[PDB]
């Protein structure tokens, strides 16, 4: 249940290490975001050879939560630690080449299909 | 909002309520008939009657559970020696509630509660 001021860990190799969500997008007074949701983030820590530096502001997509998705059978998939994958702020394609850790199945639509094409497990 | 909640609070905290039901069960098994307030009598049914259900079969560990529940030795002696076989044949309903006027002092709904052999 990612809302504003939430710290997220990065999932890809874009060059970030630890970011902070600053706004959930889509609709007014929207409280929080689920796994298939785009959120705006700012970057708090980064590796120095990254494609993004500390203090940027750009979009991101959630990929993992501790609250977890809910499959239609009644199943729920609750990870450990929330995760995001950074997006090219206007073009919404990802930055990094690869992706660490598994993702969710419900994500699967064309831009996030480009996300899952790198992903190791589902 | 107590939808299908059972158990009466009786304006007492839970540890006092537990020790009070222990003392009342002791006096009821010893003297075989007492006079007490009506909701106290109803929850005394709800406490006492599993002890006389426990007392049907004489063993060691069941007497240790009786000593865990009521914490006295003469009470469990009188229980497992007398009220075990005296209530052998029946099933349920060992306590009997008659309501007997009101308390003169604070106007409390009073009731004689007894064991049905007497």
């Amino acid at each position: 249940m990612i809302q504003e001021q939430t710290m997220l860990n990065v999932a890809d190799n874009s060059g970030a290490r630890r970011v902070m969500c600053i706004k959930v997008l889509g609709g007014s007074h929207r409280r929080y975001a689920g796994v298939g949701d785009i959120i705006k983030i700012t970057i708090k820590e980064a590796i120095p050879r990254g494609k993004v530096k500390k203090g940027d502001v750009l979009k991101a997509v959630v990929v993992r939560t501790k609250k977890g998705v809910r499959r239609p059978d009644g199943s729920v998939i609750r990870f450990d630690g929330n995760a995001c994958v950074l997006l090219n702020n206007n073009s919404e394609q990802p930055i990094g080449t690869r992706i660490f850790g598994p993702v969710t199945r419900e994500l699967r639509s064309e831009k996030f299909m480009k996300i899952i094409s790198l992903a190791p497990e589902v | 909002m107590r939808h299908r909640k059972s158990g009466r609070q009786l304006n007492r905290n839970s540890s006092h309520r537990q020790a009070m039901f222990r003392n009342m069960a002791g006096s009821l098994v010893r003297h075989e008939i007492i006079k007490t307030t009506l909701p106290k009598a109803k929850e005394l049914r709800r406490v006492v009657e599993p002890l006389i259900t426990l007392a049907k079969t004489d063993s060691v560990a069941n007497r240790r559970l009786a000593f865990a529940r009521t914490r006295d030795n003469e009470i469990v002696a009188k229980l497992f020696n007398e009220l075990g076989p005296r209530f052998a044949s029946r099933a349920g309903g060992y306590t009997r509630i008659l309501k007997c006027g009101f308390r003169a002092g604070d106007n409390a709904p009073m009731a004689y509660i007894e064991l049905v052999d007497r």
Partner: protein
């Protein structure tokens, strides 16, 4: 058309073969029997009146006993009435099973919900609790300002305040029906219907197409 009354007996869920686990509610729809048919002659409008269940003969009174012995129908607990929409009729005493609801696809439920009792405004009208600290004094969950000032000089009619919440008749519309069992006298609807288990759910075909 004509609704059916039944007993809300718990909730469960069914499994489709594809994978969707649909949470359903089981209404024991006992077969209703009409006991009075209204018509335009005495009343100006047409309607039927049904009953179901069973009742002790000591528990009925002589008025309702005469009303049930008027036309061939045994005593049943409660009475209900349905409006018989213009092109449908019955002989008095003609029993209704749950096959007319086997024809239908979208259904709606009316029933008396659970009673939360005297509820405060946070439970009742979805208010907002005030700040629990920073100096707040004896005013955590109270509604606050209930009017303007001297220029109205009155609380308006229909102010949202605390009071009775629940034990009222309320409805759910356009529920999906999944399975209409014949021999067990059952109906299964998708999702939540009002009332605690043992309620009298009066079920109609849904008006919203």
């Amino acid at each position: 058309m004509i609704g059916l009354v039944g007993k809300k007996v718990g909730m469960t869920r069914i499994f489709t073969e594809d994978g969707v686990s649909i949470p359903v509610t089981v209404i024991e729809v006992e077969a209703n029997r009409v006991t009075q048919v209204k018509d335009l002659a005495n009343d100006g409008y047409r309607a039927i009146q049904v009953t179901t269940g069973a009742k002790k003969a000591n528990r009925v009174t002589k008025p309702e006993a005469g009303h049930f012995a008027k036309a061939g129908v045994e005593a049943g607990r409660g009475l209900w009435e349905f409006r018989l929409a213009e092109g449908e009729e019955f002989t008095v005493g003609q029993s209704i099973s749950v096959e007319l609801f086997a024809d239908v696809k979208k259904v709606d439920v009316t029933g008396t919900s659970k009673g939360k009792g005297f509820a405060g405004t946070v439970k009742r009208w979805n208010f907002r609790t005030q700040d629990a600290t920073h100096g707040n004094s004896l005013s955590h969950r109270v509604p606050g300002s209930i009017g303007q000032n001297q220029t109205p000089g009155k609380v308006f009619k229909g102010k949202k305040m605390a009071g009775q919440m629940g034990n009222e008749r309320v409805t759910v519309q356009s529920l999906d029906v999944v399975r209409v069992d014949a021999e067990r006298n059952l109906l299964l609807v998708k999702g939540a219907v009002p009332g605690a288990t043992g309620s009298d759910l009066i079920v109609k075909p849904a008006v919203k197409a």
